[PDB]
Amino acid sequence: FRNSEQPTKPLQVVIAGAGLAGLSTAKYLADAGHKPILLEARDVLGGKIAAWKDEDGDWYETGLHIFFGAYPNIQNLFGELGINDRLQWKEHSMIFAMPNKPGEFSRFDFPETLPAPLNGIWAILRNNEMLTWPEKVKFALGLLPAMVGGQAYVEAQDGFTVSEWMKKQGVPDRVNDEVFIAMSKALNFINPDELSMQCILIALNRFLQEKHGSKMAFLDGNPPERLCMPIVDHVRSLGGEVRLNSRIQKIELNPDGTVKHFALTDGTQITGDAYVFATPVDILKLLVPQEWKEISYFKKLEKLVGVPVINVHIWFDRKLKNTYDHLLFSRSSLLSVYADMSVTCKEYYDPNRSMLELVFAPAEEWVGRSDTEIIEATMQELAKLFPDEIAADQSKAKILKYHVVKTPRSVYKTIPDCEPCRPLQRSPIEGFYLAGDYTKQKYLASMEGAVLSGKLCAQSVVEDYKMLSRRS
Amino acid sequence: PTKPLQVVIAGAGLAGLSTAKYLADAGHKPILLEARDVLGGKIAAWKDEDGDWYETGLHIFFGAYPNIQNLFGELGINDRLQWKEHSMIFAMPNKPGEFSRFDFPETLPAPLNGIWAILRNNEMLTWPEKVKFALGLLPAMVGGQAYVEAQDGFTVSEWMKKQGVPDRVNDEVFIAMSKALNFINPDELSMQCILIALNRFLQEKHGSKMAFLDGNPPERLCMPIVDHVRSLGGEVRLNSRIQKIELNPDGTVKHFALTDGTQITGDAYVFATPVDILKLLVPQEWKEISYFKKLEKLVGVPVINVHIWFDRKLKNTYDHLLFSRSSLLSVYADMSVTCKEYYDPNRSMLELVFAPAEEWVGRSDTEIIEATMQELAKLFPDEIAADQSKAKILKYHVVKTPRSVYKTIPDCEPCRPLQRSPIEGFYLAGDYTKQKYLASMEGAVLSGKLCAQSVVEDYKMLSRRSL
Amino acid sequence: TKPLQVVIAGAGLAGLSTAKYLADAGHKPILLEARDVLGGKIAAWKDEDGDWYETGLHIFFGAYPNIQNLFGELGINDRLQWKEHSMIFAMPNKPGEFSRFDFPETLPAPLNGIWAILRNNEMLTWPEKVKFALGLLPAMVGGQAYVEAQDGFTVSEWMKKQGVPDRVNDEVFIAMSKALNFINPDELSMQCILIALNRFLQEKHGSKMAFLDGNPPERLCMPIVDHVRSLGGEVRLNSRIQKIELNPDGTVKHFALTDGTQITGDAYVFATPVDILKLLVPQEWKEISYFKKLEKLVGVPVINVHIWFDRKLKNTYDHLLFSRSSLLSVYADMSVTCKEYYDPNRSMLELVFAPAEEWVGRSDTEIIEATMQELAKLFPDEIAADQSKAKILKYHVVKTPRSVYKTIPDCEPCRPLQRSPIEGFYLAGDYTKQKYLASMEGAVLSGKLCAQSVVEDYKMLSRRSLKSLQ
Numbered sequence A: 001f002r003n004s005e006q007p008t009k010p011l012q013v014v015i016a017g018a019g020l021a022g023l024s025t026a027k028y029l030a031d032a033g034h035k036p037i038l039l040e041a042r043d044v045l046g047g048k049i050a051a052w053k054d055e056d057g058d059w060y061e062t063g064l065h066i067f068f069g070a071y072p073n074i075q076n077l078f079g080e081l082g083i084n085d086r087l088q089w090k091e092h093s094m095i096f097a098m099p100n101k102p103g104e105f106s107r108f109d110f111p112e113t114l115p116a117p118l119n120g121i122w123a124i125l126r127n128n129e130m131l132t133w134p135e136k137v138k139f140a141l142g143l144l145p146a147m148v149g150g151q152a153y154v155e156a157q158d159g160f161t162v163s164e165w166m167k168k169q170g171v172p173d174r175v176n177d178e179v180f181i182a183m184s185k186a187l188n189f190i191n192p193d194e195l196s197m198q199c200i201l202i203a204l205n206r207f208l209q210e211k212h213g214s215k216m217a218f219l220d221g222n223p224p225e226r227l228c229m230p231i232v233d234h235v236r237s238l239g240g241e242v243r244l245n246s247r248i249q250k251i252e253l254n255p256d257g258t259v260k261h262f263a264l265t266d267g268t269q270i271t272g273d274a275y276v277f278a279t280p281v282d283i284l285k286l287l288v289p290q291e292w293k294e295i296s297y298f299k300k301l302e303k304l305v306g307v308p309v310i311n312v313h314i315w316f317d318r319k320l321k322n323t324y325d326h327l328l329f330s331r332s333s334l335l336s337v338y339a340d341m342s343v344t345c346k347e348y349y350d351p352n353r354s355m356l357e358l359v360f361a362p363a364e365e366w367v368g369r370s371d372t373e374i375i376e377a378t379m380q381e382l383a384k385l386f387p388d389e390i391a392a393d394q395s396k397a398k399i400l401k402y403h404v405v406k407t408p409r410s411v412y413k414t415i416p417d418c419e420p421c422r423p424l425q426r427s428p429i430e431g432f433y434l435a436g437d438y439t440k441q442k443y444l445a446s447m448e449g450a451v452l453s454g455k456l457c458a459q460s461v462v463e464d465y466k467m468l469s470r471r472s
Numbered sequence B: 001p002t003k004p005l006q007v008v009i010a011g012a013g014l015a016g017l018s019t020a021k022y023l024a025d026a027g028h029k030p031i032l033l034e035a036r037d038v039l040g041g042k043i044a045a046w047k048d049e050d051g052d053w054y055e056t057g058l059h060i061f062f063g064a065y066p067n068i069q070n071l072f073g074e075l076g077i078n079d080r081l082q083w084k085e086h087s088m089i090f091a092m093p094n095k096p097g098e099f100s101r102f103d104f105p106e107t108l109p110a111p112l113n114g115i116w117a118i119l120r121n122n123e124m125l126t127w128p129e130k131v132k133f134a135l136g137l138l139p140a141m142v143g144g145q146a147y148v149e150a151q152d153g154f155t156v157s158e159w160m161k162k163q164g165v166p167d168r169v170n171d172e173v174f175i176a177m178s179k180a181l182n183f184i185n186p187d188e189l190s191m192q193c194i195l196i197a198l199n200r201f202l203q204e205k206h207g208s209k210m211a212f213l214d215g216n217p218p219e220r221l222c223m224p225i226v227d228h229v230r231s232l233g234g235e236v237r238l239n240s241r242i243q244k245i246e247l248n249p250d251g252t253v254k255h256f257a258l259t260d261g262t263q264i265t266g267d268a269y270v271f272a273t274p275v276d277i278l279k280l281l282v283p284q285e286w287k288e289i290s291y292f293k294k295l296e297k298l299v300g301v302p303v304i305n306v307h308i309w310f311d312r313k314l315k316n317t318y319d320h321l322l323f324s325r326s327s328l329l330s331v332y333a334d335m336s337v338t339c340k341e342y343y344d345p346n347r348s349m350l351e352l353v354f355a356p357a358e359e360w361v362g363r364s365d366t367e368i369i370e371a372t373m374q375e376l377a378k379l380f381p382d383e384i385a386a387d388q389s390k391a392k393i394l395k396y397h398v399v400k401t402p403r404s405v406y407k408t409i410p411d412c413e414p415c416r417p418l419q420r421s422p423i424e425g426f427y428l429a430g431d432y433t434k435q436k437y438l439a440s441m442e443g444a445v446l447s448g449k450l451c452a453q454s455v456v457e458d459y460k461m462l463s464r465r466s467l
Numbered sequence C: 001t002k003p004l005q006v007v008i009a010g011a012g013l014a015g016l017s018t019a020k021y022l023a024d025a026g027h028k029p030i031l032l033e034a035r036d037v038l039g040g041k042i043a044a045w046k047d048e049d050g051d052w053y054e055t056g057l058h059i060f061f062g063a064y065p066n067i068q069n070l071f072g073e074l075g076i077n078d079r080l081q082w083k084e085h086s087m088i089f090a091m092p093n094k095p096g097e098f099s100r101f102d103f104p105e106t107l108p109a110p111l112n113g114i115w116a117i118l119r120n121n122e123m124l125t126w127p128e129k130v131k132f133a134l135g136l137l138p139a140m141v142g143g144q145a146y147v148e149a150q151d152g153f154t155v156s157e158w159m160k161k162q163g164v165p166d167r168v169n170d171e172v173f174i175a176m177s178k179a180l181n182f183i184n185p186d187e188l189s190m191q192c193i194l195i196a197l198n199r200f201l202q203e204k205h206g207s208k209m210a211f212l213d214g215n216p217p218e219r220l221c222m223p224i225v226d227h228v229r230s231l232g233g234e235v236r237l238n239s240r241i242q243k244i245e246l247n248p249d250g251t252v253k254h255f256a257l258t259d260g261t262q263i264t265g266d267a268y269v270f271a272t273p274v275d276i277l278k279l280l281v282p283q284e285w286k287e288i289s290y291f292k293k294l295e296k297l298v299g300v301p302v303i304n305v306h307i308w309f310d311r312k313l314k315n316t317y318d319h320l321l322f323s324r325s326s327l328l329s330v331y332a333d334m335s336v337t338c339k340e341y342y343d344p345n346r347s348m349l350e351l352v353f354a355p356a357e358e359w360v361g362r363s364d365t366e367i368i369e370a371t372m373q374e375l376a377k378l379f380p381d382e383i384a385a386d387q388s389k390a391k392i393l394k395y396h397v398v399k400t401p402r403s404v405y406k407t408i409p410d411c412e413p414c415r416p417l418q419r420s421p422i423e424g425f426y427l428a429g430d431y432t433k434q435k436y437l438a439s440m441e442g443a444v445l446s447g448k449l450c451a452q453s454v455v456e457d458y459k460m461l462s463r464r465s466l467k468s469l470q
């Protein structure tokens, strides 16, 4: 769609935040023939996908990011930039750890010959160590009405927690604790007793819609260089501007209530025909002008609050003999998903030294604790996953170095009844627009959600071209 | 053809005989040269002093052998195949003398007849084992050609573990099937081999149905092909071993030099010999071409075919093939019951496949017969004793083939050559060549049909090269 | 903007040249050779004893501008061993004796040629010289339109019409006809001889001859392959094209190889001999004028004989020799003329056996016997048919029953341009429309002309690539 029409006069759109939402807004506005001015607060691109190179030349990330087959807007973007080969697709499997049997792992293998949802049904049927046959029947009974259900049905489930809905549908409490604790922490870094059922249903839709919807991929290197730079190069080649260390301090308003300019941290005033806030909901809420604060659209945002998360990186002296070229569900009380980045990531490949990147969730009682306290808790959990290779007192494998990245306000906490509060990309303020994973879009608080919100934002701006050009 | 091609074929096995048959049908002149004084190759048989036949192997014809069915029909010898009951009879190693079977109902179509057979059988698989086995195999049977080719990287034992098929099922059922198809255990055999064999059970209704030839293969099967080739102007010559592939200065074939020095020439040349013999006869100037260099992976597997004539007629026998489920033996049959020409009402003869034979091809005939009698004492405990206390051996025949069919180990499929070689005028035939029906009689016949097809496709280029 | 992927069938001089100039233009050629040797009709093979034997005795001329350019571009000019500016002919009437046409290096063209004929007294009488000069003067003064008009006559026919004595046609032109197309003047087109005689009047050293310093696959074909590969091009041996698979509109879908492999590109080139192309032309193309005309162009039989003798011949030349034999054409002592084939105590004779129509079917021993009988006339005090004198250590007989197209009269309108009426399909080879005959120069020029036509159609070939992508 972002090819049609060539503007008489291109719009100058000021975008606050160069995360995937801001980068996507800038990409599709540039494709439409407009001039985006992307202003990033930090000295790094990507936001919640940002990474940094330390003194030894090793990268550490904000988080462990997994790309799914059921990410259509991400697939389109990678294809449009011709970087499809930068996604390292792994085996169609879901490998889970055994808390009862340390060092042992169980898995759900999706046959490449069976279509969706048969490959999924088969994976559950074939697995014998994570679910009993009666549990499998009760689980299938509980989920069948949900999978047959439409979009109206999944929206109606936003009033329940995962634990609440599973009990109502008769799904055994052991299934919710065995399988769904892992899935809840993976999607929103919180347990099923807090997470909205609508979140799990959009995730389970990956398993029944497309055949490879639930198939996983790792980026071949650090996201700022391998993903963010191709978008920046594309935006700049079409006349767009991308500026780092440009934090917006204030949204200055005209007497009628519309935006006058975006005042930067050094006082610099940036103007445009349209203004976009592609910042996280927490930062936007603090920067909303007093005169907007009582408008329903901005007042509803009080429900959407960032969830704490910690991303731990540990470089070991040895190469671990028992590892996978995949993502692993630790099924730990302290950890969520983890991966041996020296095996899964191309740019992070090392044949004699293995690095483990792990998501530490729930992180509410841990974001305040010291890095050594977090590493100790991680090593204690790793001694359960690698009992013959990793010991907490470094008796076996030894830590060369570590990197603990804390995000106390990451993605919005997808608790029940957040969906009516989620704003559309077009705001009731003429000339002001919103972008970000938290905005109204159907693919959760994810990389796909961020990119889609950007596409939806750019779409709303080009739709209002006539009104935005006359206002200039 | 304006002018018929003279095609020189080396080896009168089923591949060479098939190449000659279909080239003669196309109106060309095949010259089939056989090294030995017998036709058939790995299906060859010999008549001893007492007038009794002994074979290279126990051969079973399947319903899922379309090119074999076509050939028999074309020669009008369909009645020479003795189709047995649609059953799979297996011995019980734990219960000596006892047998279990998978009966395929003739009213149920494929794969329902198969599903029923497994469901009905209660002594070879437990109900949980049946479920895990069905789960493990269902994605595979639904899979296409690209899927089965992707399984060539795994052994049978490896793939069964991955798909969650119980280890007891792999040891109970698949040891028997692996030794039957390629004379090796599932820890060595490629999974692609088992998947092509299991496709017999789900494609056609009678695909897994078995048949015995009504007599010795040289007379009952090879002679009808020879008579057909000769009636259309083709030549079939025994005791004509090719000693050398003589080349022209450009690298193409000049002639085939025989053992007595005789030079045989043609417009096209075919090698329908086993891969082991071809590898030794490849000229030095061809040896580094990918097509011929890849052949190093394909090596013949040892096998032994034992024949034992007993003084009595065994009271407990079948008009069928039996899976011994032995560590030394593979499939066996009472040929005095199953084969028409070998029928004897007072004297029963047992033809048994001795596999794996790696540690046995070097051993003496008496050592092999002793091991066979010790295994027969487990299958017939009230009729056969190793010290000949019960039934007594009148005579025996031990036929050893130390390099039979290629050992279908994982990753052999990319090495398998097409019937058309990169050398202009030179072609290959044989069960080892690129064809979808394994190293079998069907594979041999299909490779022959595919070879003859490639020669007639290149008629224009082969006729111009002659002048 | 985006380099074209051009699939070329055949790594002869035409295919190698097409690949070389497409790589120079910044495109990606994929050169597929059917055999395990490069060069085609210039291919050679090393036997067990380490001695090379060739498809033919190849002579490079000064009047080969595209060959000179290629050698210069690859920096291998020193690989051509230029011989004396002479034309040495044998005397059939006087066995062992030789006559020659010496071209003075002080006289320019065609004066050096006129002088050579005037100075020679044993091959032409003074009246014969006058009648020959009279008969040829209108022809040498004539333009390109004139030489094309002579394609309707045989050499024997035109010589009789222009009043050139019948003895001149039999003495001088039998040798020249067999040298250029391995056929006698009663069959060869006069246009062929006129393009050859143009070597003698255009450039001073046009008629000067050179031998390659070694085997052509290593000394000439490898430098081209190394150059193509260094610029991103692909060269693959044992890749015979089995079928030209077509799209529903008639254009090429892919080239199907002998091992089943399907090779695709933005453009497709057939640098194969005309005989092989004619057999591979799809049925739907067979009635198009361009491909139907090719029925006239048929490969001519030729035999290249190599004989290694026990002794080094005392009476030999560091040159090419015209045997003026009824069975043989040109010959050379390769132990003298070729650098890599040099041997001081053992001499090797490489001889062209033409006309070969009645000989390609005969045995190697039958051919060697006929060659030894003819060599007993050229070396009567050194070689005897019953090996009484010099003895054969070994021999190599290379038969090409369909070599260069038989340049009989009226073949010129049938010769195709490098750009075919099929969009994306192109032709290369000595038989295609180019002015330097069925020669090494013709092959290289056709390659240059093919690569030129492909780069000229870059815009149309790049757009067609993306239209199919949709």
Ligand SMILES: Cc1cc2nc3c(=O)[nH]c(=O)nc-3n(C[C@H](O)[C@H](O)[C@H](O)COP(=O)(O)OP(=O)(O)OC[C@H]3O[C@@H](n4cnc5c(N)ncnc54)[C@H](O)[C@@H]3O)c2cc1C
Pocket: A016, A017, A018, A019, A020, A021, A022, A039, A040, A041, A042, A045, A046, A047, A048, A049, A062, A063, A064, A065, A066, A067, A246, A247, A248, A249, A278, A279, A280, A283, A309, A310, A311, A359, A407, A410, A411, A435, A436, A437, A438, A445, A446, A447, A448, A449, A450
């Ligand atoms: C530990 C972790 C693991 C994750 N795993 C996955 C996964 O497996 N799969 C998946 O799909 N998603 C995953 N995500 C989520 C994903 O990272 C986010 O959904 C997405 O990147 C958010 O996009 P965004 O553009 O809306 O916000 P952000 O990426 O956070 O971008 C906002 C940007 O605005 C900038 N900014 C802030 N204030 C200002 C200001 N005043 N002026 C200017 N700029 C400003 C920020 O610096 C930032 O660059 C994970 C996230 C984390 C933290």
Ligand SMILES: Cc1cc2nc3c(=O)[nH]c(=O)nc-3n(C[C@H](O)[C@H](O)[C@H](O)COP(=O)(O)OP(=O)(O)OC[C@H]3O[C@@H](n4cnc5c(N)ncnc54)[C@H](O)[C@@H]3O)c2cc1C
Pocket: B010, B011, B012, B013, B014, B015, B016, B033, B034, B035, B036, B039, B040, B041, B042, B043, B056, B057, B058, B059, B060, B061, B240, B241, B242, B243, B272, B273, B274, B277, B303, B304, B305, B353, B401, B404, B405, B429, B430, B431, B432, B439, B440, B441, B442, B443, B444
């Ligand atoms: C014990 C045993 C049991 C078997 N059971 C079965 C079964 O149940 N079902 C089934 O389908 N298949 C079975 N087979 C396999 C089957 O026999 C073969 O797949 C098939 O016969 C091989 O065909 P072929 O023509 O390619 O090779 P071959 O039959 O081996 O033919 C090659 C021929 O070339 C000849 N030759 C060799 N060297 C030269 C030379 N230099 N010059 C000229 N001729 C030469 C040989 O003498 C031989 O006749 C069995 C094989 C064995 C040994």
Ligand SMILES: Cc1cc2nc3c(=O)[nH]c(=O)nc-3n(C[C@H](O)[C@H](O)[C@H](O)COP(=O)(O)OP(=O)(O)OC[C@H]3O[C@@H](n4cnc5c(N)ncnc54)[C@H](O)[C@@H]3O)c2cc1C
Pocket: C009, C010, C011, C012, C013, C014, C015, C032, C033, C034, C035, C038, C039, C040, C041, C042, C055, C056, C057, C058, C059, C060, C239, C240, C241, C242, C271, C272, C273, C276, C302, C303, C304, C352, C400, C403, C404, C428, C429, C430, C431, C438, C439, C440, C441, C442, C443
């Ligand atoms: C005896 C002899 C003497 C000669 N003397 C001279 C001389 O003195 N001077 C001179 O200038 N010229 C001479 N020539 C002629 C010269 O060799 C040719 O004119 C020239 O080499 C032909 O070039 P070409 O590339 O078009 O064809 P070729 O060199 O014949 O190349 C065609 C190539 O295509 C390959 N091919 C065929 N089919 C397929 C397929 N299906 N798929 C893929 N590849 C395929 C062939 O293997 C070959 O390599 C002589 C030739 C001979 C035989």
Ligand SMILES: CNc1cnn(-c2cccc(C(F)(F)F)c2)c(=O)c1Cl
Pocket: A066, A182, A183, A184, A186, A187, A188, A203, A327, A337, A411, A444, A445, A446, A447
């Ligand atoms: C912060 N959002 C995230 C974070 N992780 N995953 C995720 C990663 C791996 C595995 C899974 C799961 F399979 F559980 F769905 C989800 C997401 O799908 C989303 Cl939407």
Ligand SMILES: CNc1cnn(-c2cccc(C(F)(F)F)c2)c(=O)c1Cl
Pocket: B060, B176, B177, B178, B180, B181, B182, B197, B321, B331, B405, B438, B439, B440, B441
């Ligand atoms: C040497 N090849 C062989 C040898 N035997 N059988 C065979 C014979 C009897 C039973 C079975 C089985 F039922 F196991 F497939 C296979 C083959 O199907 C092939 Cl392909």
Ligand SMILES: CNc1cnn(-c2cccc(C(F)(F)F)c2)c(=O)c1Cl
Pocket: C059, C175, C176, C177, C179, C180, C181, C196, C320, C330, C404, C436, C437, C438, C439, C440
């Ligand atoms: C097959 N083509 C050939 C073959 N040989 N010569 C050739 C070689 C030596 C001498 C002469 C002659 F002097 F006669 F022209 C021609 C050619 O000029 C061409 Cl075009």
